[PDB]
Structures are given as C-alpha cells and as structure tokens.
Amino acid sequence: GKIESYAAVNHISQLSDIVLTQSPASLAVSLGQRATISCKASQTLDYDGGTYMNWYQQKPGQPPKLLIFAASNLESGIPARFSGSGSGTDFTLNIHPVEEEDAATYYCQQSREDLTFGAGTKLDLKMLVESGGVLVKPGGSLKLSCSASGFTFSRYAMSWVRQTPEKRLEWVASISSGGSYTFYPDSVKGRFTISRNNAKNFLYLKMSSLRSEDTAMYYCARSGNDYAVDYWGQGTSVTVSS
Secondary structure, rough: OOOOOOOOOOOOOOOOOOOEEEEOOEEEOOOOOEEEEEEEEOOEEOOOOOEEEEEEEEEOOOEEEHHHHHHHHEOOOOOOOEEEEEEEEEEEEEOOOOOOHOOOOEEEEEOOOOOOOOOOEEEEOOOOOOOOEEEOOOOOOOEEEEEEEOOOOOHHOOOEEEEEOOOEEEEEEOOOOOOEEEOOOOOOOOOOOEEEEEEEEEEEEEOOOOHHHHEEEEEEEEHHHHHHHHEEEOOEEEOOOO
C-alpha cells in the first residue's frame, strides 16, 4: 500500500551497472597534511537534482562508518576536516588536517544503481587474532539476524553488505521499509533471502547453497538520508570451506 523507503534509487517500486574506480589504493600521509582520495564512476550518479555518492571510513575489526552522503553532505558527528566534492562521474574525499585517528580504509559507494563500492584506499600515518566466525561446508545453509532499537525500524530500508577477506565490500541484499520489495545482485539471487519483522524489529538473511566465495564478514545496515548507509551493525564472519 503506502509508499515505502528503498536502499537505492533504482529500487523504487511504487509511483509517487555502475563501477566505481577508487584511487590511490593506499596513501601515506603525515600528521596535519591533506589526504585526497578520488572515485570515478562508470556512469553519472546525478539523478533528479541529487548525486548519490557516499563515503565511508573503516577501521580494522569495525564496521564502516558514514562520513559524507550525497557527494558533499557531512554526516552529523563527523568533524569538518572531512569534506566531499564532485558531481556526475568524478568525486573526491578530502581530509585536512589529517589526524592520527584518521588512519583507516576509506571507501566510496554509489546508491544510484543498487549499491556498489570502490575498492578502497588504505590511509596510513607517518600480533593479530582474526575471527573466521561460523564454519560452513559448501552447499550448506545459515541464517543471520540483527535487531534494531532507538528508531522506528519500519520506516527504514535495510540491507546486507559483505566484506571479503580481500576487504572488498559487496552489497548482497536490500529490503524496502515495509518489506514489500526485495533486491539482490546476481551473485546471490536464488540462494540468499532477506526478510524483516517490523513488529519485533529484526532483519534476517537466509543463506543457502553456500559457496566458497560467500566467505565474508556480513553486515546488516540501515539506509538513511539520500540512500546512504548510515548505520552498520557489527559484522558476522562466515567461512565456507570443506
């Protein structure tokens, strides 16, 4: 019935392929310098007077954090040394003066046609135990969930995004706010199912016919302003191996 909220512009299903090339792969800067990170889109991201480029920061063992939405809008709580610019196909993230806590990997991401990500830029200044999560055999199945609180869950589109061991981010499912519409990339269509409970505030991902290439950290994530992914739940790692 009523209009629902979606995770990407092209997902809108009621009346009312884009590659991101991110450069450089890594950046070594000194405290207080300017860091400049570039993202070129294979198609324009301009739509209806907006431009659907978002930028995220991610530190090891943590979910990505929204920095910039709609190309140039600074997310609340992010310091103003972060800025974004660009339109159409050419986008830039600038950080100046860089601080020590800004060492991280940065990703661009577009929400004009599904959700796709740049390959990332590791920003460095000047013993590890790594979680494999749940071990599954190929062909097996698994179900993940997330809960939500502190906001009206039923008003927001939700997604699952996974991160491979190579640190690539890949969108794997979206569901509209009222759960009427679901969306998947070809890589998982027919095997993964996203669902939600708007009475108890849960999001689910059912994964079946698991493949080795489904090995990844899986994040549940909310779509906020202008199709940015503004809150990411902590990840659940899945290792598919014989």
